[PDB]
Amino acid sequence: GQKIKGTVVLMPKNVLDFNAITSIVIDTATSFLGRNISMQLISATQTDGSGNGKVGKEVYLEKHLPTLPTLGARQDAFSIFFEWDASFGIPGAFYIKNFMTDEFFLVSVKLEDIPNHGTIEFVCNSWVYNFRSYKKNRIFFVNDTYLPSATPAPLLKYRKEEFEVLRGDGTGKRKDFDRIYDYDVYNDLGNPDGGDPRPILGGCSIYPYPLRVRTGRERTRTDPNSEKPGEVYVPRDENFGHLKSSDFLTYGIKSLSHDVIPLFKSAIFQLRVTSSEFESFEDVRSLYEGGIKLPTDILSQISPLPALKEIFRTDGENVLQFPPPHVAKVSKSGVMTDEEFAREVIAGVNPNVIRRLQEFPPKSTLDPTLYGDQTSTITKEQLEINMGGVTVEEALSTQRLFILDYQDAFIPYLTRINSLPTAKAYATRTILFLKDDGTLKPLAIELSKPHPDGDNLGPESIVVLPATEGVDSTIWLLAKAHVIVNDSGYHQLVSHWLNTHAVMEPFAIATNRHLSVLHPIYKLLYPHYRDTININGLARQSLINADGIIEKSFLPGKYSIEMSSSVYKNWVFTHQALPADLVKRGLAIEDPSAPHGLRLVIEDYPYAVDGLEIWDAIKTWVHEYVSLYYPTDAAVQQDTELQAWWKEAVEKGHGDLKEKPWWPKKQTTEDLIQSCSIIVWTASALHAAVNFGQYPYGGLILNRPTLARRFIPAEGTPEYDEMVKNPQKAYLRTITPKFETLIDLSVIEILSRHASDEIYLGERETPNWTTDKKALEAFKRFGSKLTGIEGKINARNSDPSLRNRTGPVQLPYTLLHRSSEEGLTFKGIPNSISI
Ligand SMILES: [Fe+3]
């Protein structure tokens, strides 16, 4: 008829296929032709007799359009032609069927020459397999934004039925082409059939945990409540592909545990070619300095590896080396100064654990019936000798006395951790003081362990005080070392894995099952969900599993992920909001005359100043976006899909805490904006701040040690005398050994790197994600408000008064700053939790 011209853009498999990228009249676009991809339009305006929008005639792709519109690197363009029975109406969706054996990546479709109407865009960005591998036809929709009620009457069957496709039926073993999003428990970490069973985390009150994407594999012979090892399913469009093999960071990790870590083991324990121990701090450094000399046979196996090439330089071919962790401009600090040990609690890798003291001595909230007294044995008199004239009550009232308190987190797991074969750790407490130049000063480090029975005086506590001169400075350095083993343990499992990765995948599954492609709050939030179900999947398979990388490298060992469950009991959604986090830890006082409505107790607390400007910027954007679509609390009350999404996020996603009073409703405009802000703050900035500084500070194992293998040496004993004689063997003897150190440095380096692409906070995958010029305009104000913040990061970093912003390591805290480039940067806030 008056025939609608259509334009399809797609990408073959292989431009995004790692394997085909690495390689494991002429015309190729000519084959996606004839009877190979067909398409049918669906009407937003006209209906059949049951009330559902019309479907109009299956028409195959016409020609390979050779020219660039603009396209996008490896994109191939094509035209389809649809006729016009006038009475069809304007198309608001289409159905696509591929008849080819192999999938492709559909990226867009545009519709031209609709008489009376302008060009209709579709933002597709989805893998389309051969029809026969799909339940029913794929439906792609127009980029217009609609609440449930506002959906065109013709498009409602279509909108509400495609959901049912995303939810599936809660049964069956999922296949890779499938897009079914659903929930299961973490019962896939252990291998019981092989002797290494782990407790089922989730679905219990003894073992609470966020639920995760259901995979549906067969059961274990030993425990048919646990699922077998196999390859992890993620719903197909959650596995994001790439042009460039260096950007498949998951392949880099898969190859770490598989190819490399076993060669390093062959090297240390086959013939001992390189020793299992370090003898000095120069040895640990001569890995990013000269490098570790491995034989040519081990190097020549790592040197070809198509996905580990950015992570180390294998070449030199007798040596494996690198990278210099950013704790080097000064090599003598990180690893050593007292003012940097304290500076990293507020601007380091783990910046949101630190409380303020309000009573002295410090307490325990543990349970006196189960753990004994547990109160800190540190006295007024230990603190005060370094408080420079200040009495503890003076500092308590002037909000100068602070703490890093790992007592209650560790003491429950320390009988079990200390009876593991190569471990002998403490549950630590570190008092910090705020000096007049605005710097933190460690005053004392207490070290506890239950000793045997474990509900009596067990705690067995010692207090170690600051020292510059003698043996006492070596016992301080070993006390600070035990403190940072707790801290590294906690950061990995709690600050990073649980409070960002594990806790998000519930909302990510909820959004896909209950908010249509068409939904206002799907468009807002979906960027923040990119590649989270995918690194979580690999993590459940290769990092978080039995005798994997986090258990081998961190103190709790087999009890690691179980530790994040005990700590999960205490996770509060509403406390994940940075002002609420800050206010609850004593580091912010709620103030109306003040800045972000809070007065900071430690004013040069670099993270909280990242934080608050990226927090208000996120919140101003969500407040303005929500305000475009929900005019009234009644609109937030009336959204049939938002209620459903949120009812499920809580009750099935975070099911083991569904009953908590702190869980918000979705009855007002302010409740939507803040739930969405916390989710947007978690996925973008929280993760940035606790992920990208990992190889920067933890790249030196002397700075951030992960394992603790001996207690403080006993006086008048052979191992104490070796602490007087060779202090750096007494240290290295305490912390992570050579094999564990090369497993550690090697994953936290991959995890600290940004891909070429990545998409940072004020960015979006495509410009036309919505047809709302106002949503797009308030998104460019958001982008512009974030470049301003970069600008004030760079000047506070250039401001010499703000000491904590650089410190002895002379590292400008830039983990705050949205913009960054590939890799190794100590900068950059992604949209998502993408590694
Ligand atoms: Fe991460």
PDB file of C-alpha atoms and ligand atoms in Angstrom, residues 496 501 687 691 835, ligand 1:
ATOM      1  CA  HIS A 496      31.903  -5.255  48.586  1.00  0.00           C
ATOM      2  CA  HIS A 501      26.764  -7.481  44.463  1.00  0.00           C
ATOM      3  CA  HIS A 687      30.553  -0.188  44.383  1.00  0.00           C
ATOM      4  CA  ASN A 691      35.868  -1.821  44.120  1.00  0.00           C
ATOM      5  CA  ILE A 835      32.976  -6.401  38.149  1.00  0.00           C
TER       6      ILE A 835
HETATM    7 FE    FE B   1      32.839  -5.794  42.230  1.00  0.00          FE
END
